[PDB]
Design a protein around this ligand. Structure first.
Ligand SMILES: [Mg+2]
Ligand SMILES: [Mg+2]
Ligand SMILES: [Mg+2]
Ligand SMILES: [Mg+2]
Ligand SMILES: [Mg+2]
Ligand SMILES: [Mg+2]
Ligand SMILES: [Mg+2]
Ligand SMILES: [Mg+2]
Ligand SMILES: [Mg+2]
Ligand SMILES: [Mg+2]
Ligand SMILES: [Mg+2]
Ligand SMILES: [Mg+2]
Ligand SMILES: [Mg+2]
Ligand SMILES: [Mg+2]
Ligand SMILES: [Mg+2]
Ligand SMILES: [Mg+2]
Ligand SMILES: [Mg+2]
Ligand SMILES: [Mg+2]
Ligand SMILES: [Mg+2]
Ligand SMILES: [Mg+2]
Ligand SMILES: [Mg+2]
Ligand SMILES: [Mg+2]
Ligand SMILES: [Mg+2]
Ligand SMILES: [Mg+2]
Ligand SMILES: [Mg+2]
Ligand SMILES: [Mg+2]
Ligand SMILES: [Mg+2]
Ligand SMILES: [Mg+2]
Ligand SMILES: [Mg+2]
Ligand SMILES: [Mg+2]
Ligand SMILES: [Mg+2]
Ligand SMILES: [Mg+2]
Ligand SMILES: [Mg+2]
Ligand SMILES: [Mg+2]
Ligand SMILES: [Mg+2]
Ligand SMILES: [Mg+2]
Ligand SMILES: [Mg+2]
Ligand SMILES: [Mg+2]
Ligand SMILES: [Mg+2]
Ligand SMILES: [Mg+2]
Ligand SMILES: [Mg+2]
Ligand SMILES: [Mg+2]
Ligand SMILES: [Mg+2]
Ligand SMILES: [Mg+2]
Ligand SMILES: [Mg+2]
Ligand SMILES: [Mg+2]
Ligand SMILES: [Mg+2]
Ligand SMILES: [Mg+2]
Ligand SMILES: [Mg+2]
Ligand SMILES: [Mg+2]
Ligand SMILES: [Mg+2]
Ligand SMILES: [Mg+2]
Ligand SMILES: [Mg+2]
Ligand SMILES: [Mg+2]
Ligand SMILES: [Mg+2]
Ligand SMILES: [Mg+2]
Ligand SMILES: [Mg+2]
Ligand SMILES: [Mg+2]
Ligand SMILES: [Mg+2]
Ligand SMILES: [Mg+2]
Ligand SMILES: [Mg+2]
Ligand SMILES: [Mg+2]
Ligand SMILES: [Mg+2]
Ligand SMILES: [Mg+2]
Ligand SMILES: [Mg+2]
Ligand SMILES: [Mg+2]
Ligand SMILES: [Mg+2]
Ligand SMILES: [Mg+2]
Ligand SMILES: [Mg+2]
Ligand SMILES: [Mg+2]
Ligand SMILES: [Mg+2]
Ligand SMILES: [Mg+2]
Ligand SMILES: [Mg+2]
Ligand SMILES: [Mg+2]
Ligand SMILES: [Mg+2]
Ligand SMILES: [Mg+2]
Ligand SMILES: [Mg+2]
Ligand SMILES: [Mg+2]
Ligand SMILES: [Mg+2]
Ligand SMILES: [Mg+2]
Ligand SMILES: [Mg+2]
Ligand SMILES: [Mg+2]
Ligand SMILES: [Mg+2]
Ligand SMILES: [Mg+2]
Ligand SMILES: [Mg+2]
Ligand SMILES: [Mg+2]
Ligand SMILES: [Mg+2]
Ligand SMILES: [Mg+2]
Ligand SMILES: [Mg+2]
Ligand SMILES: [Mg+2]
Ligand SMILES: [Mg+2]
Ligand SMILES: [Mg+2]
Ligand SMILES: [Mg+2]
Ligand SMILES: [Mg+2]
Ligand SMILES: [Mg+2]
Ligand SMILES: [Mg+2]
Ligand SMILES: [Mg+2]
Ligand SMILES: [Mg+2]
Ligand SMILES: [Mg+2]
Ligand SMILES: [Mg+2]
Ligand SMILES: [Mg+2]
Ligand SMILES: [Mg+2]
Ligand SMILES: [Mg+2]
Ligand SMILES: [Mg+2]
Ligand SMILES: [Mg+2]
Ligand SMILES: [Mg+2]
Ligand SMILES: [Mg+2]
Ligand SMILES: [Mg+2]
Ligand SMILES: [Mg+2]
Ligand SMILES: [Mg+2]
Ligand SMILES: [Mg+2]
Ligand SMILES: [Mg+2]
Ligand SMILES: [Mg+2]
Ligand SMILES: [Mg+2]
Ligand SMILES: [Mg+2]
Ligand SMILES: [Mg+2]
Ligand SMILES: [Mg+2]
Ligand SMILES: [Mg+2]
Ligand SMILES: [Zn+2]
Lengths: 124, 83, 104, 99, 208, 138
RNA sequence: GGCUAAUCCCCCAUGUGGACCCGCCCCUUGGGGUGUGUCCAAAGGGCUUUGCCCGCUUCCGGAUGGGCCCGCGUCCCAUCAGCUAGUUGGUGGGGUAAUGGCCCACCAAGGCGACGACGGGUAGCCGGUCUGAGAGGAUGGCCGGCCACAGGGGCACUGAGACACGGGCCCCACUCCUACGGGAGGCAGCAGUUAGGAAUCUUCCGCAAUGGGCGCAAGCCUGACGGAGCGACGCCGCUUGGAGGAAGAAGCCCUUCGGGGUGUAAACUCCUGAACCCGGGACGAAACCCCCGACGAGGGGACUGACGGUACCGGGGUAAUAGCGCCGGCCAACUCCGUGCCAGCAGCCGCGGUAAUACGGAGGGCGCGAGCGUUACCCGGAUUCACUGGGCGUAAAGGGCGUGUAGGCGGCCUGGGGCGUCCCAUGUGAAAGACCACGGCUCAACCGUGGGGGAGCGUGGGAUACGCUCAGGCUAGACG
């Protein structure tokens, strides 16, 4: 575009949409489970994927993933939601944080335990 | 009423004052008028006090009022001596 | 220094007051080119001696009305009706900026 | 409870009273004078005007009027009085005005 | 806590003697003679062509493990060098070799750099007549380093200095073994040090 | 009409050299001449001369190239590798003396027009003045 | 309703001086001088009272602090295009410290807008800060400067100053008291409670220091402030040992059963001596005050420490926390076992249906290390809004075509101007931050002293090539 044109018009700064309305971008948000359901992923993958519908302190109802080998969640469980999506499930935008509130850490987890929220064993 | 006084500068347990001309209403470490000197009470360097006396004299002349401690330093630096 | 500006008189129509149109040039802060911008100043003309088309000097003054901050310092050159005309045509061009249009 | 300078408030009221009163005095006198000048009454017009001038300056003495306040009031007074006298003229006592 | 776990295993990963033990590491025990390859299960399997990154990484690691310094310190020290007027590689080496612990090793008060770190931290070392216990203290040219008088009778100090008879310290240093004092005359430059490190690679490692 | 006579001349030169002409004709203006004079002092051209063409003044610019070359493509290295306008009508460019560009690590040149006359960057720096940045050439 | 003092209020005087009207002079917006008329002053207290101190009054000037005014700069939407009756100007008033439509009467009919008026959305601004090769983008916590606010809305009073956070009046919401008439209140001060939240501290010490208010002073006040406490929240420094010690133990892992690995790692030997105990023990504090002098200058002298029995120094002295992420490619680190499109992993491509270096454990390894990871958000990479620094035949992208308004752009020669442009000087560009040097805490973080730099803007001087402008000429463009 001519210099004159840039002078008349100018470039448009490019705004960035948010991947996570955890509302006021907060690193985390507390909420309570509505449903704890399993759901089936998309084409080149098969599994029963563990998921929880949460009402949130934001006033938002969202869908969360429940990472780890097994979970204690159900019903009215209070929970912390951390954001980040499961790729191969449609519309799951956030993860549940193991080891906080009503979601316990993964039983018998030796490798990276700070994810999955489990504490250090004593060597026997 | 314009004053000559100390403003605190160095870190915790490291006091260093600027000897300073400022309106008395100012917070002590806030904007001053002129800096006419400096004072390190712990005398950690060979010069722990310095005062510009032609200027200290100016400010006194136009009615600046020293703090007793400001006064003390200025006297040490001979602002006051008339001989 | 009380600021002096130079302008063309584009308005006769008040009492003891003229409107003085004043151009300004400068490099665009980013795109670099020299751009020309302009502002109308209401200036004090007590003797009503300044006419339309006059190029005058305007001097920063003690406030006179709400939005009269300048007085007319001196006349520079008498009558340039081209500058006035340009102003007028620009104004008349507004006629079609809105829901429809008239003639160009 | 009871932070003890509402003393300041009380005083403020007293002073409010004094100032109000002085101001009233000045205004009623000024009107009296001007209204007299209206009538070509110049002798007592200037007599009153003189009292008023005094009251004004005396106000300026303390916090009632203070400085340019009074000066302005005095000016507007004398201007109006003289302006009214001429238009029927004869500055009889000529008390307050330069000849 | 900068490193402090088995060492000759680093001698072994970087494929070069790092001299982290003092004695031993001279004799035929260093594990470079006696199995010079990486540690662990796969150490003896055929190596694969290293990425540019792997090269730069390992060079950096080599230089760092030599001085025993941490990565945080190493990096800050490096940023310092990059800021200073004059060639970053050289300057970085000079800043590194200027550490008090290092100087205590180079002077031969301590057999190793780790031992020097301890000698310093326990205050058997004096800089300019005054005790200094901080290993990271930067010795400036002209500074005189010595063994504190009360520690002059320590069996290990007497010993280490006894073996220092008839040995020469670096050209940027000078040592009086009779008074147990050194002096840091000049910043050493790359060619004073024999270090098996191409520092261009290190510079290139942070350039990323 | 011709919106940028200086650009036009620079381009005539580029265009001409890319086909290895011995000379080209640019229409004549004093300013153009001053630019040419810089080029010809600097080695980019053999020189130039005032010339009449159909009764109108022109500047015949004599082009200059390198030795003939080996391999496929015998064509010579150009003496003017790069000739480029900076300031144009429609964006004018003025540098202060601290801002005079240094073209191609000194192997190239910039040509400023200053109130001390048309100069090269070196001339301008030594003369301590800035100006309109006309073109760069290397 | 009654008594009463004063540095409380008032009246006359004195008028240095000053204020106002009118004239005159210089000056030029309401600055300075001058004449006549008028108007305007004061407060007393302490002493060793025979003279000093503390004050009071008018005035001129200084210093500091402020008000008001102008140029320029200051986010998104044009799916906001027209806005405007105190509106725009005038005369005369009112108001104020003071200009002003600030307010009012009357008169005129204007003012603003595509160079974005009006409307809507968001937002305290700045020094700076983060990022970036830079240009740029993003931000404005703490520290310093300015603004604004003190439950919400209005208003004034008292003052040099407020339209006043811990002052006053009224309306509204809320809490509490209530003899139902009516009252009280305002932590966006320090702490602390409660609620909301992913989340943010002690109802601590001290007036010793610096600073502030009043006081002749002695002194009083000061949740400013100096400190301590709590939290790896950040940064920096430090420890968990150092030297020796096997062709190399046991256990655990891999195995071609020959062996390989963890590994000098351990054990063990020897040395040092964090922690801890004992002893001494701070700087920060010399003024205010006392002495001589002269309540000055000058000289000399003594009191005062929350932090703290802390830092520090001396003596003694124990081998004395390590974790966290990762090892398919990007990306540094590979094997065994379990699982069999399950369970799971996942930033992207992808991995898992029987050999899985991609799941889970283990061995081993890589990276960091009192931390290591995760989520969020900003810049980066993204030359992916392209000024630096991009494009439009077929990838996104030439308007269906013209006519022309505003605007953008403009051939050759000469002259004046010197607006753009360039150069010099000067002022400004506070402090802090950044940069450089030297220094103080054993180092560093942190801090001190000094130096340099700096866009932009003001003022003076200069240059004239180019751009502008005015004046004249040409004919190669254009038209005839
Ligand atoms: Mg699959
Ligand atoms: Mg102030
Ligand atoms: Mg001295
Ligand atoms: Mg004096
Ligand atoms: Mg003009
Ligand atoms: Mg008219
Ligand atoms: Mg007016
Ligand atoms: Mg005038
Ligand atoms: Mg219209
Ligand atoms: Mg319409
Ligand atoms: Mg009180
Ligand atoms: Mg009181
Ligand atoms: Mg009345
Ligand atoms: Mg007035
Ligand atoms: Mg460097
Ligand atoms: Mg040397
Ligand atoms: Mg070595
Ligand atoms: Mg040819
Ligand atoms: Mg020639
Ligand atoms: Mg080219
Ligand atoms: Mg450019
Ligand atoms: Mg400039
Ligand atoms: Mg260079
Ligand atoms: Mg009574
Ligand atoms: Mg009585
Ligand atoms: Mg007199
Ligand atoms: Mg009297
Ligand atoms: Mg009185
Ligand atoms: Mg009396
Ligand atoms: Mg007396
Ligand atoms: Mg001022
Ligand atoms: Mg109205
Ligand atoms: Mg009206
Ligand atoms: Mg008026
Ligand atoms: Mg108005
Ligand atoms: Mg405009
Ligand atoms: Mg708007
Ligand atoms: Mg806001
Ligand atoms: Mg913003
Ligand atoms: Mg940076
Ligand atoms: Mg950078
Ligand atoms: Mg960019
Ligand atoms: Mg920047
Ligand atoms: Mg901003
Ligand atoms: Mg805050
Ligand atoms: Mg602040
Ligand atoms: Mg409000
Ligand atoms: Mg509140
Ligand atoms: Mg409310
Ligand atoms: Mg309110
Ligand atoms: Mg007062
Ligand atoms: Mg008042
Ligand atoms: Mg108040
Ligand atoms: Mg209030
Ligand atoms: Mg307020
Ligand atoms: Mg309060
Ligand atoms: Mg208050
Ligand atoms: Mg009340
Ligand atoms: Mg209330
Ligand atoms: Mg509070
Ligand atoms: Mg309360
Ligand atoms: Mg809660
Ligand atoms: Mg706190
Ligand atoms: Mg206390
Ligand atoms: Mg105190
Ligand atoms: Mg004090
Ligand atoms: Mg109290
Ligand atoms: Mg505090
Ligand atoms: Mg060992
Ligand atoms: Mg074994
Ligand atoms: Mg193990
Ligand atoms: Mg074995
Ligand atoms: Mg022992
Ligand atoms: Mg002390
Ligand atoms: Mg002392
Ligand atoms: Mg005291
Ligand atoms: Mg005496
Ligand atoms: Mg004395
Ligand atoms: Mg000890
Ligand atoms: Mg000992
Ligand atoms: Mg042990
Ligand atoms: Mg791959
Ligand atoms: Mg990496
Ligand atoms: Mg790899
Ligand atoms: Mg299964
Ligand atoms: Mg994993
Ligand atoms: Mg992510
Ligand atoms: Mg199987
Ligand atoms: Mg398998
Ligand atoms: Mg497979
Ligand atoms: Mg595996
Ligand atoms: Mg993976
Ligand atoms: Mg695995
Ligand atoms: Mg650390
Ligand atoms: Mg980005
Ligand atoms: Mg980069
Ligand atoms: Mg870039
Ligand atoms: Mg894009
Ligand atoms: Mg571009
Ligand atoms: Mg592109
Ligand atoms: Mg197609
Ligand atoms: Mg297309
Ligand atoms: Mg077409
Ligand atoms: Mg169309
Ligand atoms: Mg056309
Ligand atoms: Mg046109
Ligand atoms: Mg033009
Ligand atoms: Mg031309
Ligand atoms: Mg000319
Ligand atoms: Mg000029
Ligand atoms: Mg600065
Ligand atoms: Mg130092
Ligand atoms: Mg700047
Ligand atoms: Mg300047
Ligand atoms: Mg100038
Ligand atoms: Mg000339
Ligand atoms: Mg012409
Ligand atoms: Mg024809
Ligand atoms: Zn070794």
């Amino acid at each position: 575009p001519t210099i004159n044109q840039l002078v008349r018009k100018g470039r448009e700064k490019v705004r960035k949409k948010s991947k996570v309305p955890a509302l006021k971008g907060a690193p985390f948000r507390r909420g309570v489970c509505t449903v704890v359901r399993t759901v089936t992923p998309k084409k080149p993958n098969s599994a029963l994927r563990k998921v929880a519908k949460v009402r949130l302190t934001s006033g938002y109802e969202v869908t969360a993933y429940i990472p780890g080998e097994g979970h204690n969640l159900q019903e009215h469980s209070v929970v912390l939601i951390r954001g980040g999506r499961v790729k191969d499930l449609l519309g799951v935008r956030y993860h549940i944080v193991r080891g906080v509130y009503d979601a316990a850490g993964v039983k018998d987890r030796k490798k990276s335990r700070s994810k999955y929220g489990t504490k250090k064993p004593k060597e026997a | 009423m314009v004053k000559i006084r100390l403003a605190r500068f160095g870190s915790k347990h490291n006091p260093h004052y600027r000897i300073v001309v400022t309106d008395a209403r100012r917070k002590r470490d806030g904007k001053y008028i002129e800096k006419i000197g400096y004072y390190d009470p712990r005398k950690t360097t060979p010069d722990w006090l310095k005062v510009d006396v032609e200027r200290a004299r100016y400010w006194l002349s136009v009615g600046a009022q020293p703090t007793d401690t400001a006064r003390r330093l200025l006297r040490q630096a001979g602002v006051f001596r008339q001989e | 220094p009380k600021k002096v500006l130079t302008g063309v008189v584009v308005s006769d129509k008040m009492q003891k007051t003229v409107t003085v149109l004043v151009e300004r040039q400068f490099p665009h802060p980013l795109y670099g080119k020299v751009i020309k911008r302009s502002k109308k100043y209401l200036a004090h003309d007590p003797e009503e001696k300044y006419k339309l088309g006059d190029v005058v000097e305007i001097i920063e003054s003690r406030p006179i009305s709400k939005r009269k901050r300048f007085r007319v310092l001196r006349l520079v050159e008498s009558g340039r009706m081209d500058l006035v005309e340009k102003y007028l045509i620009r104004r008349q061009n507004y006629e079609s900026l809105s829901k429809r249009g008239g003639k160009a | 409870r009871n932070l003890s300078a509402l003393k300041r408030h009380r005083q403020s009221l007293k002073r409010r009273l004094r100032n109000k009163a002085k101001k009233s005095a000045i205004k009623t006198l000024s009107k009296k004078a001007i209204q007299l000048a209206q009538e070509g009454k110049a002798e007592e017009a200037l007599k009153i005007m003189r009292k008023a001038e005094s009251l004004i300056d005396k106000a300026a003495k303390g916090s009632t009027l203070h400085k340019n306040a009074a000066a302005r009031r005095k000016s507007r007074l004398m201007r109006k009085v003289r302006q009214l006298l001429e238009a029927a003229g004869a500055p009889l006592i000529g008390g307050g005005l330069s000849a | 806590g900068r490193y402090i776990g088995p060492v000759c295993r680093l001698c072994r990963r970087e494929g070069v003697k790092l001299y982290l033990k003092g004695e031993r590491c001279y004799s035929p025990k260093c594990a470079m003679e006696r199995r010079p390859y990486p540690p662990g299960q796969h150490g003896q399997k055929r190596a694969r062509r290293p990425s540019d990154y792997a090269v730069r990484l390992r060079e950096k690691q080599k230089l760092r493990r030599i001085y025993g310094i941490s990565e945080r310190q190493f990096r800050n020290l490096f940023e310092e060098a990059s800021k200073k007027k004059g060639v970053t590689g050289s300057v970085f080496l000079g800043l590194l070799e200027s550490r008090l612990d290092n100087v205590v090793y180079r002077l031969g008060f301590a057999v190793s750099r780790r031992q020097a770190r301890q000698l310093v931290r326990h205050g058997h070392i004096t800089v300019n007549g005054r005790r200094v216990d901080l290993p990271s203290y930067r010795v400036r040219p002209g500074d005189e380093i010595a063994v504190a008088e009360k520690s002059r009778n320590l069996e290990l100090i007497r010993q280490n200095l006894e073996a220092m008879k008839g040995r020469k310290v670096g050209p940027w240093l000078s040592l009086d073994v009779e008074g147990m004092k050194g002096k840091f005359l000049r910043l050493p430059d790359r060619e004073d040090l024999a270090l098996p490190v191409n520092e261009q690679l290190v510079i290139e490692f942070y350039s990323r | 009409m011709l919106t940028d006579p200086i650009a036009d001349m620079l381009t005539r030169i580029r265009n001409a050299t890319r086909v290895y002409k011995e000379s080209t004709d640019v229409p004549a203006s004093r300013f153009k001449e001053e630019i040419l004079r810089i080029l010809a002092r600097e080695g980019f051209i053999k020189g130039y001369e005032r010339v009449d063409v159909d009764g109108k003044p022109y500047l015949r610019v004599y082009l200059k190239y390198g030795p003939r070359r080996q391999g496929p493509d015998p064509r010579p290295e150009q003496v003017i590798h790069h000739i480029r306008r900076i300031s144009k009508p429609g964006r004018r460019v003025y540098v202060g003396v601290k801002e005079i560009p240094r073209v191609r690590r000194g192997l190239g040149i910039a040509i400023l027009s200053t109130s001390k006359g048309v100069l090269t960057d070196r001339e301008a720096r030594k003369l301590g003045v800035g100006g309109e940045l006309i073109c760069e050439v290397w």
